[PDB]
Amino acid sequence: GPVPSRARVYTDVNTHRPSEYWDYESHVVEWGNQDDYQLVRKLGRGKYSEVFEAINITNNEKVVVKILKPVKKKKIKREIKILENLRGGPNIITLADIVKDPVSRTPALVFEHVNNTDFKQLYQTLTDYDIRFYMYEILKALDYCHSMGIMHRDVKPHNVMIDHEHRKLRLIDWGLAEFYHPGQEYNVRVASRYFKGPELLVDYQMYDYSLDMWSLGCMLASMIFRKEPFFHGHDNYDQLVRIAKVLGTEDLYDYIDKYNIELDPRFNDILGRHSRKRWERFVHSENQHLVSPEALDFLDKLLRYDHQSRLTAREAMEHPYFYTV
Numbered sequence: 001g002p003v004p005s006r007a008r009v010y011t012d013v014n015t016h017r018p019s020e021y022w023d024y025e026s027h028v029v030e031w032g033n034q035d036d037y038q039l040v041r042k043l044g045r046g047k048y049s050e051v052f053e054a055i056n057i058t059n060n061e062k063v064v065v066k067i068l069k070p071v072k073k074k075k076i077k078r079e080i081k082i083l084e085n086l087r088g089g090p091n092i093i094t095l096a097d098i099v100k101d102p103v104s105r106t107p108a109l110v111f112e113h114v115n116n117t118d119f120k121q122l123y124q125t126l127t128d129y130d131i132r133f134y135m136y137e138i139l140k141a142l143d144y145c146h147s148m149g150i151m152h153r154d155v156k157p158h159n160v161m162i163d164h165e166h167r168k169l170r171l172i173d174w175g176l177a178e179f180y181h182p183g184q185e186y187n188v189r190v191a192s193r194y195f196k197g198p199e200l201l202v203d204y205q206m207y208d209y210s211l212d213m214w215s216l217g218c219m220l221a222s223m224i225f226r227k228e229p230f231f232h233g234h235d236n237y238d239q240l241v242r243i244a245k246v247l248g249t250e251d252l253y254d255y256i257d258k259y260n261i262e263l264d265p266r267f268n269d270i271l272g273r274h275s276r277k278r279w280e281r282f283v284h285s286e287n288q289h290l291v292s293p294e295a296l297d298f299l300d301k302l303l304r305y306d307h308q309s310r311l312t313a314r315e316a317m318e319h320p321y322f323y324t325v
């Protein structure tokens, strides 16, 4: 069978806490007053959610209401408990209230409003210092949730809200987040395709917080090289091939051998043979202003097939890339 793995850091944080902290199924959800909120306009539409800008009529405060399609009750309880546990954490979105629609029986999460600007629109004004600054803000959020025994499992630009004017960053959408328990085998059908780590692609169930560090690496690579997404897979199998075209196939096979992973037969037909590419190969005139030897060294540490070799959020915070922040 596959070789078992344990997180390098925060391994037993949940073991040493009472069941109330991590037993989300036993969490008692209490509704606020949906009448305290007046919907203004639609902001977005997710996989199983509709998002509205709203105002809290009791204090004239602008808020965001995430109307959830109650497809799985257990999943809703999980998101709420995690948001409750992490409430007040550095750069963690604040859950302000939980409400229900009495006629159609629809739960809704109410969050603090963030005046967001998309990646494509943001890139043109972003300087080298700004990328270091915001990357550090994400790391504070990840080191905090990892220290709290939680894996985000959906790190990507769409889940990072940035109010550039106020230099304010918030890590959002905790619907796929999960508590880390050493030796637990997790569902690999998490994260978004472009940001899925190698462990998810090769079906290695015993993963940990490091998964988020791979996603963070994918984000950094797309910014410094202005190639969005960096690893552009067209399906989950193809996603691993796109990673192998950069990291090379040698280190991939060493990784599956180390953990005794049974690689799906499909891969023999699409994987092939690929050299390990130098990171400098992705530097061009359009992207060179956000590239430095420190940036490439930092990216190299984050983007590693072996989840245990990847830098932890605390280790990433000590990298020379952030000496200027």
Ligand SMILES: CC(C)c1ccccc1-c1ccc(C[NH3+])cc1Cl
Binding pocket: 116, 117, 118, 119, 122, 123, 126, 130, 131, 134, 135, 138, 156, 157, 158, 159, 160, 161, 162, 219, 220, 222, 223
């Ligand atoms: C600077 C920032 C941390 C970053 C680094 C790498 C890739 C993308 C991004 C990014 C994330 C979210 C948003 C707003 N939704 C905008 C941007 Cl520019």
